[PDB]
Amino acid sequence: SQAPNDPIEQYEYAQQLLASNKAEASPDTRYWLEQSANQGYLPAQKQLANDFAKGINGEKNETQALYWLTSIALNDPTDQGFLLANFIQRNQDKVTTSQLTEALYQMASQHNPAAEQAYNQLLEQRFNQLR
Amino acid sequence: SQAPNDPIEQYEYAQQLLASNKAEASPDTRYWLEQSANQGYLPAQKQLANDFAKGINGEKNETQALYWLTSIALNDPTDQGFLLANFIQRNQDKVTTSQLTEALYQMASQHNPAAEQAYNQLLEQRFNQLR
């Protein structure tokens, strides 16, 4: 059972896998950070925000970077938007209000039925263009 | 002493002043909403967000609208970014990532020294252009 369920041991397992330094890109590091971050573990959310922004353990994903930055803003009383603001500021050329809208609805959709409808509408239109 | 110190009575005084319906624009309604909102009273923050967005009790102010929307996201567990996202989405033509950056640093500057420096840098540059 090499499969932690507690967010602290998930986060630590992610570091352990990364330290194995196979290719230094560790997709399972991203996987375990996500499990940890989804249970609200702030260190995992911070690492995941950097991972998605920079493409550390996998592809870059600006919208998911913005999502985790938003999560950090909501859950770190000494952040309250600093990392998100600085990311937008230094990526003014790449970050669109559209990506930010999607990340925000993604966050809001957890406890707000109106947000879940708007989020799904964005996803469905983003998908029917690839279709 | 027509000057409440408790955020609930401030909020209620704001409604009372507004119901006087002098010009239906009530700058003192905005004033008391701000006192209430600054002590963390969510109903005041929501009304103030609408006030700044629409110019109800005074001039419009998109950056302050975004600020209070951010505050609502951080303090309303069933919002978590919905009102902010929807505001950006329906004002894509007016809202700039620059205004959002300023609102976010304004929020973050309360408990983050790095945010306060970045916020002041934005303010100082915004002021030296009018100078």
Side-chain angles (χ1 to χ4, degrees):
Chain A
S1 173
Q2 219 134 243
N5 291 283
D6 166 275
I8 288 76
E9 48 185 30
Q10 288 173 340
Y11 172 82
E12 280 167 4
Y13 190 47
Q15 316 307 321
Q16 175 186 332
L17 296 175
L18 181 58
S20 301
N21 245 273
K22 271 228 181 67
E24 189 66 291
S26 175
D28 271 4
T29 291
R30 180 175 287 190
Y31 176 87
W32 287 110
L33 288 175
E34 289 170 333
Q35 302 310 303
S36 182
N38 275 126
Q39 314 184 53
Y41 192 53
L42 184 61
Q45 299 181 359
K46 282 174 170 168
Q47 192 166 345
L48 206 51
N50 286 314
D51 184 6
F52 279 120
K54 295 174 170 74
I56 298 298
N57 299 305
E59 61 194 29
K60 292 173 177 182
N61 187 326
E62 302 285 287
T63 299
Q64 286 314 287
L66 289 168
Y67 170 75
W68 287 113
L69 290 166
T70 300
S71 184
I72 292 160
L74 270 59
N75 296 114
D76 181 348
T78 60
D79 178 79
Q80 298 192 312
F82 170 72
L83 290 172
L84 179 63
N86 193 275
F87 181 80
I88 294 166
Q89 184 177 49
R90 69 184 189 261
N91 294 282
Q92 288 190 319
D93 296 326
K94 289 194 297 180
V95 168
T96 70
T97 52
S98 169
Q99 290 170 317
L100 177 71
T101 296
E102 181 177 335
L104 286 167
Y105 278 140
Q106 187 185 332
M107 184 71 196
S109 63
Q110 295 166 332
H111 302 110
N112 182 315
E116 168 78 344
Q117 293 305 283
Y119 179 47
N120 289 346
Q121 191 273 340
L122 277 188
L123 296 183
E124 279 165 34
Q125 289 301 111
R126 194 181 68 167
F127 180 65
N128 287 343
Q129 73 186 8
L130 315 164
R131 242 49 210 159
Chain B
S1 173
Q2 219 134 243
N5 291 283
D6 166 275
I8 288 76
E9 48 185 30
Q10 288 173 340
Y11 172 82
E12 280 167 4
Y13 190 47
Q15 316 307 321
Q16 175 186 332
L17 296 175
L18 181 58
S20 301
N21 245 273
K22 271 228 181 67
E24 189 66 291
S26 175
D28 271 4
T29 291
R30 180 175 287 190
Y31 176 87
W32 287 110
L33 288 175
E34 289 170 333
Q35 302 310 303
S36 182
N38 275 126
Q39 314 184 53
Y41 192 53
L42 184 61
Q45 299 181 359
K46 282 174 170 168
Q47 192 166 345
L48 206 51
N50 286 314
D51 184 6
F52 279 120
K54 295 174 170 74
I56 298 298
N57 299 305
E59 61 194 29
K60 292 173 177 182
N61 187 326
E62 302 285 287
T63 299
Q64 286 314 287
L66 289 168
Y67 170 75
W68 287 113
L69 290 166
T70 300
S71 184
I72 292 160
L74 270 59
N75 296 114
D76 181 348
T78 60
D79 178 79
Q80 298 192 312
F82 170 72
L83 290 172
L84 179 63
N86 193 275
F87 181 80
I88 294 166
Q89 184 177 49
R90 69 184 189 261
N91 294 282
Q92 288 190 319
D93 296 326
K94 289 194 297 180
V95 168
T96 70
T97 52
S98 169
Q99 290 170 317
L100 177 71
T101 296
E102 181 177 335
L104 286 167
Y105 278 140
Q106 187 185 332
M107 184 71 196
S109 63
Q110 295 166 332
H111 302 110
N112 182 315
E116 168 78 344
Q117 293 305 283
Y119 179 47
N120 289 346
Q121 191 273 340
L122 277 188
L123 296 183
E124 279 165 34
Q125 289 301 111
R126 194 181 68 167
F127 180 65
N128 287 343
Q129 73 186 8
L130 315 164
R131 242 49 210 159

